[PDB]
Design a protein around this ligand. Sequence first.
Ligand SMILES: [Hg+2]
Ligand SMILES: [Zn+2]
Ligand SMILES: [Zn+2]
Ligand SMILES: [Zn+2]
Ligand SMILES: [Zn+2]
Length: 541
Amino acid sequence: PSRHRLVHALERTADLLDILDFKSRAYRSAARSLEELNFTGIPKVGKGIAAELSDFARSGTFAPLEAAAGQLPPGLLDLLGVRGLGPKKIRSLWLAGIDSLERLREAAESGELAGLKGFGAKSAATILENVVFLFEARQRQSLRAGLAVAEELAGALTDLSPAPAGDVRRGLETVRAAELTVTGTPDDVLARLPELTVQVLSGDYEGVPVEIACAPAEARGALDLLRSGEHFAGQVQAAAQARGFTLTAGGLSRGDEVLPTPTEAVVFHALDLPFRPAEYREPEHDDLWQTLPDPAELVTVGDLRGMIHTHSTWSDGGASIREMAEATLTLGHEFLGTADHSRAAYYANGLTIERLREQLKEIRELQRAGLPIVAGSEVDILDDGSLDFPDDVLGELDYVVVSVHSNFTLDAARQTERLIRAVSHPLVTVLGHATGRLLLRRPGYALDLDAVLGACEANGTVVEINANAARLDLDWREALRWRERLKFAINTDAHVPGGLRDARYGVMQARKAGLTPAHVVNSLGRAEFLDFVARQRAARG
Ligand SMILES: [Hg+2]
Ligand SMILES: [Zn+2]
Ligand SMILES: [Zn+2]
Ligand SMILES: [Zn+2]
Ligand SMILES: [Zn+2]
């Protein structure tokens, strides 16, 4: 209600638009007018600002900020929660390739943060402190933070033969702790990591909970099975007892017998069991996993020739198209897929039709210069199911991604009809992050996924497995159920060059679903890709 509160929301919207001038200025000026006032009458508050305020008074929720929550990248929404980061700093972090809490934490660690204009050693440590607060708040950590921390601590435990364990090892979209496995004694570990406390050892590394379990070389194999873990651990112990063995972190035994257990494989042999890959040790796999491909057949980051659905400076990215293309090449991939937002995504600097035409001219130039690029767009799905760009405009593109970035509160039946309509379009090639979920922030919108996926199958539209650690959507559980009926795309949705290294998280999800390079369009070379979508479009109408 407070009028001073309205001024703040108006002032926070201009700051958000500043991050990525005809409404940033419009919102900033409307804030300065509401200042000196002891909405339809107020100065400088056009039809726009007036209407939303009344709704803010009513609803108790400022519309423009809700729109932005749905349009902005997950990592940016995070940085906006780091106490002490102003608009100008968040913008310079973005342009510097720092796009997430985890990546910010690493930048602080390495001196990279301090090396930026406006940051020094001191502010870089204050920011690291403030990021530690965000992490300790969360009950569970993102796969990115947990995996990064486990990888870093392994670095200090090199001669103890470190290995990721538990949740990070099998790619849980969300993670209880940075879990590591190690051979040696709690003193060996305590000598390289004095911080920890012996309970296994546990502790807290920069807000991220840590657990390190150790064992003698001869028990390591059993320790690795048990720390996989919880659901599977119970399974494998049940299996052991049912056969006269006792499985413990201390090793595999049989009455008097103590069988040497150096490797997981050895334990399976001893119980006369088929080896069960860590990728398949979730509950949902219990009755399915022997139907799925051998790990050596599953997709890998190296199988991703085409890196599609990426963002640039044209939209709400932090790098030019050239920097991104160069980046995908030095990471070992073949070509880059452009895909900036459209018109409707206002708070994400979406492209008007005219600006899109300008982007296409630039892409043609980069191609002349020998850069492997395919031009696309992430077209917003309007609330009725129609697309943000006209058909003739969509026709200029090499490929089209469709996505929801607005109206997350439509009823289930309206939302389902909306997405079925969009994935049924003749020109659509990929459905972006189907569910709109953001791990640790907001659940996805209410819809009937099976109906929507069915519509994808019927139109041969490929469904995206968004590799961004805050999305990991389509969920691997739904991909597992539909692996026979859909083609998938493992897309990073990179808003920054380093974002292309997220592919590794999408791949971990794809492998649990049992996907091979043949299930994933990204495995096609550039020319193979361009006629896949030509065939895809020919197969309809
Ligand atoms: Hg130990
Ligand atoms: Zn974006
Ligand atoms: Zn044509
Ligand atoms: Zn998107
Ligand atoms: Zn996107």
